[PDB]
Design a protein around this ligand. Sequence first.
Ligand SMILES: Nc1nc2c(ncn2[C@@H]2O[C@H](COP(=O)(O)OP(=O)(O)O)[C@@H](O)[C@H]2O)c(=O)[nH]1
Ligand SMILES: NC(=O)c1c(F)ccc(OCc2nc3cc(C(F)(F)F)cnc3s2)c1F
Ligand SMILES: [Ca+2]
Length: 306
Amino acid sequence: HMATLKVIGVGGGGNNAVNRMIDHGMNNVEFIAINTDGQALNLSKAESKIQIGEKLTRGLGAGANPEIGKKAAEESREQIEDAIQGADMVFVTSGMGGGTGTGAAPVVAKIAKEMGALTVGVVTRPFSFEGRKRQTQAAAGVEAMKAAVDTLIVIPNDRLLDIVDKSTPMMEAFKEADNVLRQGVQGISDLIAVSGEVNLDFADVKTIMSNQGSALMGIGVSSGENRAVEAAKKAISSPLLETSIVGAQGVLMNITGGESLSLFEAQEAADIVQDAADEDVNMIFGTVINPELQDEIVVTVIATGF
Ligand SMILES: Nc1nc2c(ncn2[C@@H]2O[C@H](COP(=O)(O)OP(=O)(O)O)[C@@H](O)[C@H]2O)c(=O)[nH]1
Ligand SMILES: NC(=O)c1c(F)ccc(OCc2nc3cc(C(F)(F)F)cnc3s2)c1F
Ligand SMILES: [Ca+2]
């Protein structure tokens, strides 16, 4: 089995994330760009582009109206279905609070889910500086997304204000939010491609992520003394995510290390994650030994079921 992965941007912010991922370089992933705005869509780097709602919008965006995004996606339902064909896992990425993403992303997600793809949403909430109506529209979008997806990751854009100094470029801050999605997608690609010593596969991902609600996903990288604890703590920290590790009922955890990876340090790392999560956690633990590594380890945590 070699899972077919698709990443679907919906609306401006979603397609921004897709464009920046295509620039970064991602092999064996199909990118799909969905927008009402034909001008923006023409500039996308994606090899699959779906202009939605042209009869409704005349090729403009949705003008921040979620109803127009929803109706646009419904107008173009067949074209969305065609683009998703074959997917085993779909990431739907979108900025909540505008028109196209808020309205169309839940329609796209439901199409993917009903095609049998594991459907993961990765969405932003607006900055508080964008105001109340934007935040209220976004909240309705988040709720609609939750209904439509298997698992949802929410990045409040206000969390970016916690990781910048007064001079950090806005584009550099956006790249931090992009990395949540990128690391998730790359993590799945790695799981599918690499044989673990304690091997995890796509069925494990489905067990942890299918028909859940909110999710945390995170990676931590460290070396030297206390590397296992440090990497595990970093993985669960998730400063940009709305969802925390506390109370998680399902966890997929992997440790990748060199030949030096010790049993003791695997336990230390796993204990950090366990102590943070529910009493009845269903933890699926994996390990990869990569002999090309020296002293670095990478801990990956996906947590669901709250
Ligand atoms: N982090 C991040 N947030 C974005 C970006 N673009 C837009 N946003 C957010 O996404 C929300 C919706 O904007 P947009 O996606 O352009 O609207 P739509 O095209 O009508 O779906 C905005 O209110 C912002 O909070 C981006 O590139 N990065
Ligand atoms: N132990 C393994 O088989 C193994 C591997 F070989 C390579 C990489 C591994 O872990 C990476 C993962 N990344 C994600 C990302 C996601 C998510 F949330 F969809 F982005 C879900 N599950 C995983 S598992 C492994 F668990
Ligand atoms: Ca594997």
